[PDB]
């Protein structure tokens, strides 16, 4: 009886070790799949970094993004924060931005656009824009990294549905 109890305990330890090994295997599979997803996100981030290396292509995209951000603002005076490299480009596009803002909404004209003297870090931000009001109370993120990270939420399910069926 005692030997049967001890044998049952040892067999229970064996089944527990088997369940732990199975849990480690499932955790390894999950870690591998997550490494694959993070790898795909890494390749997508590389493609995004490569797409942000073209100024000619990003110019009109920056204009459209600034227009879309201004449409989500509708403030009389708009404060804009951008990277140091996009400073001159945005400064030259100021008139085009005002014209595009006036064309987008004629019920809410744009009085002034204030360019912040604080530029985003070159290492931290590879591109994008930052929109804000005159009082800087509300802010919309036009940044590429933020847009991609936020999109990834609803994109992951769709990408998985496409790839894995």
């Amino acid at each position: 009886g005692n030997f049967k109890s001890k044998l049952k305990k040892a067999m229970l330890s064996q089944q527990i070790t088997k369940s732990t090994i199975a849990n480690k295997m499932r955790l390894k599979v999950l870690s591998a799949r997550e490494q694959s997803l993070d790898g795909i996100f890494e390749e997508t981030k590389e493609k995004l970094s490569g797409i942000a290396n073209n100024r000619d292509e990003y110019k009109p995209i920056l204009q459209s993004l600034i227009v879309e951000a201004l449409l989500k603002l509708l403030e009389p005076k708009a404060i804009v924060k951008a990277l140091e490299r996009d400073v001159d480009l945005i400064e030259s596009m100021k008139d085009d931005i005002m014209r595009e803002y006036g064309e987008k909404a004629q019920r809410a004209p744009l009085e002034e656009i204030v360019i912040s003297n604080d530029y985003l870090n070159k290492d931290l931000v590879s591109g994008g824009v930052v929109v804000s009001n005159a009082s800087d109370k509300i802010e919309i993120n036009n940044t590429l990294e933020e847009r991609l990270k936020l999109l990834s939420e609803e994109a992951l399910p769709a990408i998985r549905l496409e790839l894995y069926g």
């Binding site: 089944q15 527990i16 369940s19 199975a22 849990n23 499932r26 955790l27 999950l30 870690s31 799949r33 997550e34 490494q35 997803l37 993070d38 009082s135 800087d136 109370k137 509300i138 802010e139 919309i140 993120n141 939420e153 609803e154 992951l156 399910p157 998985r160 549905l161």
Partner: protein, 453 residues
């Protein structure tokens, strides 16, 4: 993202310079110390908005804080990879695993089943317990609670039930369950973890663990995530979903705390007035869907305060859920196996799993007869304890010994011991033999002649 905030009072938050806020919308709160706390929107009036902080308003600057509003309602990252993996009350992995890939993002609030689309509880299941079979039957897909007391073996009984569930059920595709805890003890958490580990169902089940050390909001939101998970499992995954929830009392007291903190109009016993509907939200979510395979069976576990069955918690629980399994502290101090009170404990529909074509037609009548003999035995026990042992008739002492034997044998089996339905019916047939022939008036002649050896 709005960095503008106006006032701060207690455990809440109020912001301005915003518009078109959504009820119970997901909102990210970035504090001055860099701490990122998730929160939900409470109400919105004009250009002003009011929301409740989950992580608390303690240690937060007014003008140094930023807030990002998603605008979408409460959203959870449900998936098919949740099986085998453990999650916390905040949705974050408690298994120390990598990022969980969401198959679908759905509201954790849950959608009420349409009456016409709602299917009645059917078939049956084997819980491994005689009282969970004979006295009160448990249908598959139905909803019944468990009322226990503090200090009693509630965790042990729940562990035994969860362990013997899928084991005994196969004698009637393995059964899949879900473990959920809200504001529970660390010791009870370790006990439940060791229970799920011993049962080995942890691989086929999911776990939502909200510690008592964690906030009340996360604990209350744990039930929603578990509800959405079980719903996705019983609909999208098309599998059998068992719902195991514990420490409902903590969530109730926390709910009363949240209701009082907002200075809202309280209901009975200082609780909320919407408490009935609040419980009925996840209570009426259980059931069967016509045309859809699988079902969600709700097996909640609650603890009545100060072992009081007259407590508002148990009353509202019974007013929400249909039927319950009561655990009395009177038989808990007897040293016998787990103390289920046959009188107070009952099932909503015990006639669905009864009758011919399912198991046997001798089930229900034997249940009624056994309940009658047990109740008569209890009354006779009271009378015997009152007047005396020599002041009672023969039927009184007979029913007394029968009830005592029913408590010592039928009611007492074991935690790791799962009694088959056949063994339960046989033990019941042997239990009825203890009583006289004219003792049971709830039994038919054919069953009486068939059961009696």
């Amino acid at each position: 993202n709005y960095n503008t905030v106006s006032g701060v009072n207690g455990p809440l938050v109020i912001l301005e310079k915003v518009k078109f806020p959504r009820y119970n919308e997901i909102v990210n709160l970035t504090l001055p110390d860099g701490t990122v706390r998730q929160g939900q929107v409470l109400e919105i009036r004009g250009d002003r908005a009011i929301v409740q902080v989950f992580e608390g308003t303690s240690g937060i600057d007014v003008k140094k804080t930023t807030v990002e509003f998603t605008g979408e309602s409460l959203r959870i990252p449900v998936s098919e990879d949740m099986l085998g993996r453990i999650f916390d009350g905040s949705g974050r992995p408690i298994d120390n695993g990598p990022k969980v890939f969401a198959e679908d993002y759905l509201d954790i609030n849950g959608s009420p089943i349409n009456p016409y689309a709602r299917i009645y509880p059917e078939e049956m299941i084997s819980t491994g317990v005689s009282a969970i079979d004979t006295m009160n039957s448990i249908a598959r897909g139905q909803k019944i609670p468990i009322f226990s007391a503090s200090g009693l073996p509630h965790n042990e009984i729940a562990a035994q039930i969860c362990r013997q569930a899928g084991l005994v059920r196969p004698t009637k595709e393995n059964f899949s369950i879900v473990f959920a805890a809200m504001g529970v003890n660390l010791e009870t958490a370790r006990f439940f973890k060791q229970d799920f580990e011993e049962n080995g169902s942890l691989e086929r089940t999911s776990l939502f663990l909200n510690l008592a050390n964690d906030p009340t909001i996360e604990r209350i939101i744990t039930p929603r995530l578990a509800l959405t998970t079980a719903e996705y499992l019983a609909y999208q995954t098309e599998r059998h979903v068992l719902t195991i929830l514990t420490d409902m009392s903590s969530y109730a007291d926390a709910l009363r705390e949240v209701s009082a903190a907002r200075e809202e109009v309280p209901g009975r016993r200082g609780y909320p007035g919407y408490m009935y509907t609040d419980l009925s939200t996840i209570y009426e979510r259980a059931g069967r869907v016509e045309g859809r395979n699988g079902s969600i069976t709700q097996i909640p576990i609650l603890t009545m305060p100060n072992d009081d069955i007259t407590h508002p918690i148990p009353d509202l629980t019974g007013y929400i859920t249909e039927g319950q399994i009561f655990v009395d502290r009177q038989l808990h101090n007897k040293g016998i196996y787990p103390p289920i009170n046959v009188l107070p404990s009952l099932s909503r529909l015990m006639k669905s799993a009864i009758g011919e074509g399912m198991t046997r037609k001798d089930h229900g009548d034997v249940s009624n007869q056994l309940y009658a003999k047990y109740a008569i035995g209890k009354d006779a026990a009271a009378m015997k304890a009152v007047v005396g042992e020599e002041a009672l008739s023969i039927e009184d002492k007979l029913s007394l010994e029968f009830l005592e034997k029913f408590e010592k044998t039928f009611i007492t089996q074991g935690a790791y011991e799962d009694r088959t339905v056949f063994e339960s019916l046989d033990q019941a047939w042997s239990l009825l033999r203890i009583y006289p022939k004219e003792m049971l008036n709830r039994i038919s002649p054919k069953i009486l002649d068939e059961f009696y050896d």
